[PDB]
A paper describes a structure:
HAdV-D10 is a rare serotype isolated from the eyes of patients with conjunctivitis. HAdV are non-enveloped viruses measuring 90–100 nm and arranged in an icosahedral capsid with protruding fiber proteins at the pentameric vertices. Structural and biological studies of HAdV-D10 knob protein highlighted low-affinity engagement with native adenoviral receptors CAR and sialic acid. HAdV-D10 possesses characteristics of a promising virotherapy, combining low seroprevalence, weak receptor interactions, and reduced off-target uptake.
Taking all together, we generated the first reported structure of the HAdV-D10 fiber knob and demonstrated that HAdV-D10K can form weak interactions with several known adenoviral receptors and may use CAR and/or sialic acid for infection. We demonstrated that HAdV-D10K forms a stronger interaction with CAR than CD46 and DSG2 (0.44 μM). This is still considered a weak interaction in comparison with CAR binding to HAdV-C5 knob (0.76nM). We conclude that, although the binding is weak, HAdV-D10 can bind and use CAR as an entry receptor.
Residue numbers in the entry:
A (entry chain B), B (entry chain A), C (entry chain C): 187 to 369
Amino acid sequence: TRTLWTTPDTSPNCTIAQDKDSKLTLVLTKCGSQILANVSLIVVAGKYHIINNKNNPEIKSFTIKLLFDKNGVLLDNSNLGKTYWNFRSGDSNVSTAYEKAIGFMPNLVAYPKPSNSKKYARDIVYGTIYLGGKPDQPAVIKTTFNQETGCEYSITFDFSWSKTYENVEFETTSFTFSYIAQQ
Amino acid sequence: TRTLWTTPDTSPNCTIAQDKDSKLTLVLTKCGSQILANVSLIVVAGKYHIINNKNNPEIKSFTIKLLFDKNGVLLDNSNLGKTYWNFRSGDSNVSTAYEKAIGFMPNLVAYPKPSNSKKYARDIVYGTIYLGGKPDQPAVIKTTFNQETGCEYSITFDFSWSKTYENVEFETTSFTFSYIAQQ
Amino acid sequence: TRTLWTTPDTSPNCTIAQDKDSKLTLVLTKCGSQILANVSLIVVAGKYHIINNKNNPEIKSFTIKLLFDKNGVLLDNSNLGKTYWNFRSGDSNVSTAYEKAIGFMPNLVAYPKPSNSKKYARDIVYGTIYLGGKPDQPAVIKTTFNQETGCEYSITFDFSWSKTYENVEFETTSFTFSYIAQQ
């Protein structure tokens, strides 16, 4: 499978700025032609952990890329660690190894490659999450489909602020969206 | 079925202002009592294609109506073209229009018809999409259930901008919501 | 089952400020590891029915708590009435009470208890609903998971305004979100 996730375990699984500096809590759940997605992010390390824009005003956005082969396995030059990401059983993920989740991938027809044809804005799903769950502390999470090259399919999360933040931990609220499946 | 959609093909399928001037990319996917919906809009023609509010400040909202008989077939005086809209098999629809679509329709109990009784606002699901996928360029998408007359069921999208736009193509981001099913 | 709901009937089922003063229209629908949730609120009685902030500027937020035992039955010191809340069969509920809908519950792993650790903000799902479906009249709906004590699981809705409202009926638009299931 119903579900292809990174375990909810919060053992860091994502490399933004330095090795295993973050936990991306992505959960994809197939309902026929739509994948239902729930996403969250805890930076625990280095750049992007604590934000001081009085210090570093240049720092106010970053990116996490998920790339996939013709089959839909995570290509290990994705920001996300390949081991934790696999179809879920219970509190774990069937262990074994991931293979053949096509149609967990976003539809190429619906969400074309940049090369294949002129892209429209339906490729994108803007959402807003909140740092520390504080209403005064929002940030944007622009999810973008099959727009990376060096892969057959992409999901790519772009995080951005626009507010000058002084000592704010980048741990987000949950956000939910859907996209159209390849099959 | 799982899914009732307009093909993602982007061959114009919707009549807002003039014949086939737009592509409504609606995708309904039944999860028991809830329909999970993903919606997008590309205007390609005439009024509402390029927005100049310096020229036409009066122009900042329009409407797309989906009407359904007792059975849940699109009544062909809906803004959406009746041919492209049918239960999905592959990237097409078996290309013979459906007969038994009910319970893709929004619940009359939950979302009543405009009776004498006190009407509550739970009929409505406000969302925000973004023109050209630009954060500076938002617009509203008020989805409204079973409030149109001359039909048994309605889904109706109301698009509005508070913002004075100078030469902006009305092509939207994806937006996802859910409603309660009739059956 | 697919669905665990409060009937869509407008018969008050929730106690905010005084006995049965409100109708919470909560609808949980299991798609594997994610619950897809649709929520609405009609206050019909007493404090929080009509809002005058010229009169009572102190009044601009309130809370509805859903509590669950190890098994996932609503504990009857929840704001929501235990009788109307049960797995859906037609537009009714088989009128025989459920025990142990676990995995309609939010995951403890994902959404931990306030257990003496660093708590992260992924517990929370901020949304905005609109009073009377009027764009000028928004309110916030901070949904928060497993953060209440005297229970094994919690869903808790926090409603807040920040705008001075003069004679506004607190009846909301629908709002849709998802959380990760326990199992």
